[PDB]
Design an enzyme around this catalytic site. Structure first.
Site, PDB file in Angstrom:
ATOM      1  N   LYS A   1      20.501 -30.064  -6.678  1.00 32.80           N
ATOM      2  CA  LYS A   1      20.887 -28.810  -7.311  1.00 32.80           C
ATOM      3  C   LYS A   1      21.784 -29.025  -8.532  1.00 32.80           C
ATOM      4  O   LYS A   1      22.367 -30.101  -8.702  1.00 32.80           O
ATOM      5  CB  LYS A   1      21.547 -27.885  -6.280  1.00 32.80           C
ATOM      6  CG  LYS A   1      20.610 -27.529  -5.127  1.00 32.80           C
ATOM      7  CD  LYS A   1      21.201 -26.493  -4.168  1.00 32.80           C
ATOM      8  CE  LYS A   1      20.187 -26.159  -3.086  1.00 32.80           C
ATOM      9  NZ  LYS A   1      20.688 -25.180  -2.095  1.00 32.80           N
TER      10      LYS A   1
ATOM     11  N   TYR B   1      11.103 -20.288  -3.821  1.00 37.79           N
ATOM     12  CA  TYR B   1      11.810 -19.741  -2.667  1.00 37.79           C
ATOM     13  C   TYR B   1      11.196 -18.464  -2.127  1.00 37.79           C
ATOM     14  O   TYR B   1      11.861 -17.715  -1.418  1.00 37.79           O
ATOM     15  CB  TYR B   1      13.277 -19.487  -3.026  1.00 37.79           C
ATOM     16  CG  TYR B   1      14.091 -20.747  -3.195  1.00 37.79           C
ATOM     17  CD1 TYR B   1      14.271 -21.626  -2.126  1.00 37.79           C
ATOM     18  CD2 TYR B   1      14.691 -21.056  -4.416  1.00 37.79           C
ATOM     19  CE1 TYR B   1      15.023 -22.781  -2.263  1.00 37.79           C
ATOM     20  CE2 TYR B   1      15.450 -22.212  -4.567  1.00 37.79           C
ATOM     21  CZ  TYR B   1      15.616 -23.068  -3.483  1.00 37.79           C
ATOM     22  OH  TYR B   1      16.380 -24.206  -3.602  1.00 37.79           O
TER      23      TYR B   1
ATOM     24  N   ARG C   1      16.937 -34.143   5.975  1.00 33.80           N
ATOM     25  CA  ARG C   1      17.801 -33.041   6.382  1.00 33.80           C
ATOM     26  C   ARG C   1      19.079 -33.518   7.060  1.00 33.80           C
ATOM     27  O   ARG C   1      20.149 -32.954   6.833  1.00 33.80           O
ATOM     28  CB  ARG C   1      17.037 -32.067   7.277  1.00 33.80           C
ATOM     29  CG  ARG C   1      15.932 -31.316   6.525  1.00 33.80           C
ATOM     30  CD  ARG C   1      15.067 -30.501   7.457  1.00 33.80           C
ATOM     31  NE  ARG C   1      15.875 -29.581   8.249  1.00 33.80           N
ATOM     32  CZ  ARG C   1      15.651 -29.296   9.526  1.00 33.80           C
ATOM     33  NH1 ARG C   1      14.630 -29.851  10.167  1.00 33.80           N
ATOM     34  NH2 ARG C   1      16.480 -28.493  10.175  1.00 33.80           N
TER      35      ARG C   1
ATOM     36  N   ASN D   1      25.532 -25.957  -2.623  1.00 36.12           N
ATOM     37  CA  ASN D   1      25.547 -27.092  -1.720  1.00 36.12           C
ATOM     38  C   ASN D   1      24.802 -28.362  -2.114  1.00 36.12           C
ATOM     39  O   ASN D   1      24.270 -29.075  -1.262  1.00 36.12           O
ATOM     40  CB  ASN D   1      25.228 -26.664  -0.279  1.00 36.12           C
ATOM     41  CG  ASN D   1      23.885 -25.990  -0.147  1.00 36.12           C
ATOM     42  OD1 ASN D   1      23.147 -25.841  -1.124  1.00 36.12           O
ATOM     43  ND2 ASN D   1      23.565 -25.556   1.067  1.00 36.12           N
TER      44      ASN D   1
ATOM     45  N   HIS E   1      18.643 -29.728  -1.696  1.00 37.48           N
ATOM     46  CA  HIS E   1      17.652 -28.960  -0.973  1.00 37.48           C
ATOM     47  C   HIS E   1      16.740 -30.010  -0.359  1.00 37.48           C
ATOM     48  O   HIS E   1      16.539 -31.080  -0.943  1.00 37.48           O
ATOM     49  CB  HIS E   1      16.828 -28.063  -1.910  1.00 37.48           C
ATOM     50  CG  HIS E   1      15.547 -27.576  -1.302  1.00 37.48           C
ATOM     51  ND1 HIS E   1      15.462 -26.396  -0.586  1.00 37.48           N
ATOM     52  CD2 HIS E   1      14.315 -28.132  -1.249  1.00 37.48           C
ATOM     53  CE1 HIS E   1      14.226 -26.257  -0.118  1.00 37.48           C
ATOM     54  NE2 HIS E   1      13.520 -27.299  -0.510  1.00 37.48           N
TER      55      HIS E   1
ATOM     56  N   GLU F   1       5.852 -27.454  -0.963  1.00 33.76           N
ATOM     57  CA  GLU F   1       6.916 -27.663  -1.946  1.00 33.76           C
ATOM     58  C   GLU F   1       6.605 -28.815  -2.899  1.00 33.76           C
ATOM     59  O   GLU F   1       6.920 -28.750  -4.090  1.00 33.76           O
ATOM     60  CB  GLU F   1       8.245 -27.926  -1.242  1.00 33.76           C
ATOM     61  CG  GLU F   1       8.755 -26.758  -0.411  1.00 33.76           C
ATOM     62  CD  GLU F   1      10.202 -26.930   0.052  1.00 33.76           C
ATOM     63  OE1 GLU F   1      10.756 -28.050  -0.046  1.00 33.76           O
ATOM     64  OE2 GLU F   1      10.793 -25.931   0.512  1.00 33.76           O
TER      65      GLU F   1
END
Lengths: 144, 143, 144, 143
Positions: free
Chosen positions: D10, D50, D86, D113, D116, D127
C-alpha cells in the site's frame, strides 16, 4: 526523413466503431502503425499529457472528454510522418476540415474531433515517450 | 450471449498493411475490439501460447512464423464472439476459405494465414489471460 | 539536482533471493524506487539495450546471461542519483568492490555481478525510455 | 502445495521507504516474488479491485487511500502461499498484530495497514488476473 508521431483515436472514434477505418486512412497513406494500445486514461494521465495547455479555457473540458471512455494510442512511422499525420487528420474544426480527412468524415464537433496527432517533431518525441517504452514500438517491412 | 475471444493479427497481416481492414471486418459484424496491443512475441511467449499444439507437426513452424515480426493482439467482445470470430476469419486453408472472409481476402497460405481466433470459450479465457490483464480490457457503448 | 537513473537486478540477484536486500540498499541511501517491473528479457531486448557495446568481446556472453532468467527493472530517483547508484553498486569486479556495496556483498563474479546501473545522465535517459513509459514512473513523498 | 497469491504494498509502505524490507520478509520465508510492478491506481481500478467490498462501510475510504499514491503490485509463489502471506502480514488491526509481522512493524493504523494479501485461493486467481498477464509472471529457481 522517416519519423515517428503519436496518434490517438479519441473516445468518440471508438463509440462510432470506426477504429479500423481510421487506421486504414493512415495505412493507405504510408503511415505505418508501429505501436498500438487500447487504454482508458485516468485524469492524472490526461492532465499530464495536456499540461502545456493547462492555462487554456478548453483544458478542463478536454480532459473530461479524453477520460470519458477508452482511446486507442498509436505511434505512426513514415516519411514526414508528423506533417502527413496532420494532413490526414484535417483541420481541428470538422466543418473547416478538407475533403477525405478523418475529421471531415468522422468527427462530430471541434470538441469531439475523433483524433489527436503530435503538432511537431519536438512534441512527438515527448508524447510517444509518455505513452510507450521504446520496447513497445516495432517497425516491420511492408510487403505483399 | 455476449462473449470475449482472442484475435491475433499475424505478422503477414501487418506486412500487408491491412490492420485496419481486418479490424473493420470485426467492427462491421458487431465484434467490438475491447483490448488491442501491438507486440513482438519472443519464442517462449509463442511456445507457451501454443502449448496445446506442442505435439503437432506444425508447431515448430507456427512458432517461428509467429515470432518473425510483430503481431496485433486483440480481445473481441460480442454476441457469440468465439464462433462469430472464427466464421469471419474463414477456413485455415485459404484455398477453401469462404468469400468475404479475412483469410480468403488476405491469407497467402495455410502457414501464413493472417489471423488467429480462440477455438472455444474455455480456451478463449486462457488465451485472453495470457496476454491481457483484466485492467487492460475496456468495454464501451456504441453510438 | 534530483535525477533518475536505471537499475537492473540481474538474474543472479533473483536466484539468490536478495531482491529486497538490494532495494533496501538503495532506499536506505535515499535512492527512491519510482518505477519497478519484474520482466524476462528477450534476446532482441537485451541486444538492443546493450547495442553500443556490440563490438566488445563480452557482448554475446552478457546477452545470454541477461536473458537466462527474469530481472527486476527499476528507476531510482534522488539527488545525484546516477553517481550515487554507481557508488552503491560498487566496482564491476566484486573482488575489487568496496566494503558495503551490492557487488561486494552479493555478486558472484565479474560476469555475474548482480546489478546494472546507468553510467551517465545521458545514458540514463535512454535506458529509462527503453524500458518505461513516463506514465509508469511515479514519484511519492517520503514520510514516517 | 505451491500456490500463487497477490500482495500489494500500500501507499504508506512506499512512503516509509520499506519496500525492500517488506519484500525481504517474503523471500526469507520462502515466498518468491514472481511478478512485481509499481503502479498508481486510478479510482476505477481500485473500485473494480475491491468490488467484493462495495457494500462494506470502509469501501470509500479504502479506495481513496489506495489511490492516494503509487503501490507495488506483486505475485508471490510458494508452499501454502495464500495462508503464509496472510500470516506474515499480520492482523488487519496493527494494534493486535503479532510480533515480527509486517503490520506490527510498519502499519500505522487499521486504514493504513501497509499491505494487502489475497484472502483465499479463488480470490487470488481473480486478483492476479486483474493486475497481471500470465506473460508478466515468471518463476525462477533459487540457488
Amino acid at each position: 526523413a522517416i519519423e515517428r508521431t503519436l496518434s490517438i483515436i479519441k473516445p468518440d472514434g471508438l463509440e462510432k466503431g470506426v477504429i479500423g477505418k481510421i487506421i486504414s486512412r493512415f495505412e493507405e497513406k504510408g503511415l505505418k502503425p508501429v505501436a498500438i494500445r487500447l487504454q482508458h486514461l485516468s485524469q492524472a494521465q490526461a492532465e499530464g499529457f495536456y499540461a502545456v495547455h493547462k492555462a487554456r479555457p478548453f483544458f478542463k473540458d478536454l480532459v473530461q472528454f479524453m477520460i470519458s471512455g477508452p482511446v486507442v494510442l498509436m505511434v505512426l512511422e513514415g516519411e514526414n510522418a508528423v506533417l502527413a499525420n496532420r494532413d490526414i487528420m484535417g483541420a481541428t474544426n470538422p466543418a473547416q476540415a478538407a475533403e477525405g480527412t478523418i475529421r471531415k468524415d468522422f468527427a462530430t464537433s471541434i470538441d469531439k474531433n475523433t483524433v489527436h496527432g503530435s503538432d511537431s517533431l519536438e512534441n512527438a518525441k515527448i508524447e510517444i515517450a509518455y505513452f510507450f517504452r521504446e520496447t513497445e514500438i516495432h517497425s516491420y517491412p511492408y510487403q505483399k
